[PDB]
């Protein structure tokens, strides 16, 4: 279940590995539009936080969840800032969200007295005055319940079929990164002159077994000249002395 667009949902994603290879390479998505970032470089990014916006809209409304957009959805249901950083992802959900009699459990705001600000949600049921006479909270002549249900049906043309749309919004520099993509490792090769990188510790040398005993906390050591003496491997905690290449 996705929220309706007016009843927008927001999941907070923190303290995790942001593996996006599952999303940017997905063939199930018709839209994968990244703003300020490249889809295939998402795994190289770090965020303070990622927020996931999860909701259902019509196919011709997919373009509205974007920076620079206006319209009933872009202005009354949900706005993205013009300088938005993140990716807008969408796919057809006609076989999930449409219902034969119309999936009218999903609604969008048709009436509002003003436009939304970026990341603002509006779930008010206040009766909108379209005309000149007061409504006093009651539906009637030129007085409306602000939400409009969607006639999502399996027989709708594509522009009227439901789409599941997810926006991954990127939060930076408010706090340290807690969300980072995955880091790809290689095989560990011993008794060769190599260019190495153990997590963040780099250099050139020959890796051989060490007779050192590190305290559980200590991952690598230092010689009297403060050069790297040995490095304990990140996957298996073996300590390897680093011999300079002759």
């Amino acid at each position, epitope marked *: 279940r996705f929220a309706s667009v007016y009843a927008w949902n927001r999941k907070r994603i923190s303290n995790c590995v942001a593996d996006y290879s599952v999303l940017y390479n997905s063939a199930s998505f018709s839209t994968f539009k990244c703003y300020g970032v490249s889809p295939t470089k998402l795994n190289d990014l770090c965020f303070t936080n990622v927020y996931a916006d999860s909701f259902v809209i019509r196919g011709d409304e997919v373009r509205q969840i974007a920076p620079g957009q206006t319209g009933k959805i872009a202005d009354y249901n949900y706005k993205l800032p013009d300088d938005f950083t993140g990716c807008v992802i969408a796919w057809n959900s006609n076989n999930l969200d449409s219902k034969v009699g119309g999936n009218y459990n999903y609604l969008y705001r048709l009436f509002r007295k003003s436009n939304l600000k970026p990341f603002e949600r509006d779930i008010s049921t206040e009766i909108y005055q379209a*005309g000149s006479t007061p409504c006093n909270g009651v*539906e009637g*002549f*030129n007085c*409306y319940f602000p939400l409009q249900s969607y006639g999502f049906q399996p027989t709708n043309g594509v522009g009227y079929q439901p789409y599941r749309v997810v926006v991954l919004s990127f939060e930076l520099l408010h706090a340290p990164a807690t969300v980072c993509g995955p880091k790809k490792s290689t095989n560990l090769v011993k008794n060769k002159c190599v260019n190495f990188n153990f997590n963040g510790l780099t250099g050139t040398g020959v890796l051989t077994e060490s007779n050192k005993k590190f305290l559980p906390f200590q991952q690598f050591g230092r010689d009297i000249a403060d050069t790297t003496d040995a490095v304990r491997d990140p996957q298996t905690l073996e300590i390897l002395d680093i011999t300079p290449c002759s």
Partner: antibody
Amino acid sequence: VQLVQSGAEVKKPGSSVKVSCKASGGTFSSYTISWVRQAPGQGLEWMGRIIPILDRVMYAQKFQGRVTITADKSTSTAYMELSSLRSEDTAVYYCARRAIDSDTYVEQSHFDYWGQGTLVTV
Amino acid sequence: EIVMTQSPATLSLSPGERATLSCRASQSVSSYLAWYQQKPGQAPSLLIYDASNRATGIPARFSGSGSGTDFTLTISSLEPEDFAVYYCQQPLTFGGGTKVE
């Protein structure tokens, strides 16, 4: 912007009547259809109305619980059914239209066209 | 609902004379008042909309004014064909109607 109503019918008290009006195609995208009744020898009374662009219906209080108003978008036809009829319900049932703004939903209070009216005898 | 009263119930004029009709509502509708002219055998014909605006196809002899709860119809000079029953309509209700004879 024409409207053609069905002809007269005679009903037994306690039975229902379903009155229908056919609008020119395209009416439902820019107009709402309201129902007005006129008992013989009487003035006009408003019964209710449908807005095809909102799927909303408003009713006169005296007919709440007695009258159902709907429309068939594929046939440009407005419908009204009175569930249980009494002799005081004899009237000409008219359809008439009010334009509506599809962006703001501001509806007109006046009718720029009336059908000929359908007489239902009870 | 909005209770509407029209006054007088009947008028008696010669063709060529000026006539006005008064309408009062128990509730304000701002300017949302429609005036109709009904003749026997016909559905009511719109004369004026939004209290004072003349309807398309209606001759210049028809005019009007009003707001809120109090409205007036003016026929500057009645023609032999204007001895009709006039009605005041608001979005929810109608008045009883006034006959000009």
